[PDB]
Design a protein around this ligand. Sequence first.
Ligand SMILES: [Mg+2]
Ligand code: NA
Ligand code: NA
Ligand code: NA
Length: 210
Amino acid sequence: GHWAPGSHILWRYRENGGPHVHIARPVTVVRDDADLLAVWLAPGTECVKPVLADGTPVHLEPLATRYTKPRTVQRDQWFGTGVLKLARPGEAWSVWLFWDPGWRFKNWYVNLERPLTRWEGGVDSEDHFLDISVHPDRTWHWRDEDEFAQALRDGLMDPASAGRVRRAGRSAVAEIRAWGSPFADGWEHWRPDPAWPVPSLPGDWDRTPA
Ligand SMILES: [Mg+2]
Ligand code: NA
Ligand code: NA
Ligand code: NA
């Protein structure tokens, strides 16, 4: 069914090309219905993320080896300001909103990704490398095209799957140009309940969907 608002769930990503969870983010359900899942990732939340096995942050590893060196997982507090994440069922992206301090809206970010798979504890995806940034003035640009390219060269995607990601990118860009959902929907005015606690990272955050 659908989770009640205020419910705590996990928003997760698998490792690239494998079954194990490498990102796990406890989030609070904002909305969950036939048209949309919306969740809030609060500052200070304990999350899991990948790191290189030698301790190098993934983003700090030179691009040539970023996707080839062995990885492990680390638990640590979410860095920086909170994120509201929105995803339509079946859609090969989610849209995340970020604000500067004092809730001054900054941008929407379209994260191209495998359509979320719902399971008992939350939703799982696989990241598709390419992102889009959208500004309040309705302009847009790609982000992480370099990572996308490298991931292709390293065989993390085959040309077919890469084609599908770019097709999704073009569909999201058509939505941005049309100023469709969720851009036009006023999520930038959304605020969390100040009563909501910060959700904990469950000890079994790594369990696979049955
Ligand atoms: Mg991404
Ligand atoms: Na979506
Ligand atoms: Na709007
Ligand atoms: Na919006």
